Write a protein that binds this ligand. Structure first.
Ligand SMILES: CCCC(=O)OC[C@H](COP(=O)(O)O[C@H]1[C@H](O)[C@@H](OP(=O)(O)O)[C@H](OP(=O)(O)O)[C@@H](OP(=O)(O)O)[C@H]1O)O[C@H](O)CCC
Ligand SMILES: [Zn+2]
Length: 158
């Protein structure tokens, strides 16, 4: 199973559990036709660390950008070698059964490459969603429609 894409992004906690903070972590993302998984990146050795998350591609119903937070820390506010792994201001979402996984890219070009490839892979799903939430689901509700359920029907036609 070939690795379609491999990048270092910033991600928001999916807060699956109740006892989970709303924090961001740098992770190494790999995209195969079967799964989108992320690991801790071992910077020193220059390799991927322990798998920290995974999502079966057949469970993805939607992939799209997402309106930026209005007050982003410097870490997410809009030389290359360093900035491309320190600054992640272009967010996008990977929607599936367990709410949305938010991912922050370093450049707009990269987010485009990913969003384009994730669409080719999900093209094979039997029931993609026609709608989605354009804004972050932050603080118990969707800032784009105010619905509460993470997996609440998207408040906007694709
Ligand atoms: O700090 P802490 O390590 O407890 O934060 C967790 C971290 O945000 C996890 O993300 P990853 O390290 O990328 O795995 C969160 O899990 P996910 O976003 O689902 O991957 C974790 O919360 P949940 O597991 O959703 O319960 C945070 O506690
Ligand atoms: Zn919405």
């Amino acid at each position: 199973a070939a690795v379609i894409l491999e990048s270092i992004f910033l991600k928001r906690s999916q807060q699956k559990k109740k006892t989970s903070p709303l924090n961001f972590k740098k992770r190494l993302f790999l995209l195969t036709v079967h799964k989108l998984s992320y690991y801790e990146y071992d910077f020193e050795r220059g390799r991927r660390g322990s798998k920290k998350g995974s999502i079966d591609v057949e469970k993805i119903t939607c992939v799209e950008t997402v309106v930026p937070e209005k007050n982003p820390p410097p870490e997410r506010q809009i030389m290359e070698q360093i900035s491309i792994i320190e600054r992640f201001p272009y967010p996008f979402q990977v929607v599936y059964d367990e709410g949305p996984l938010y991912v922050f890219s370093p450049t707009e070009e990269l987010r485009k490459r990913w969003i384009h490839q994730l669409k080719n892979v999900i093209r094979y799903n039997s029931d993609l969603v026609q709608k989605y939430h354009p804004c972050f689901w932050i603080d118990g509700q969707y800032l784009c429609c105010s619905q509460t359920a993470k997996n609440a029907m998207g408040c906007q036609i694709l």
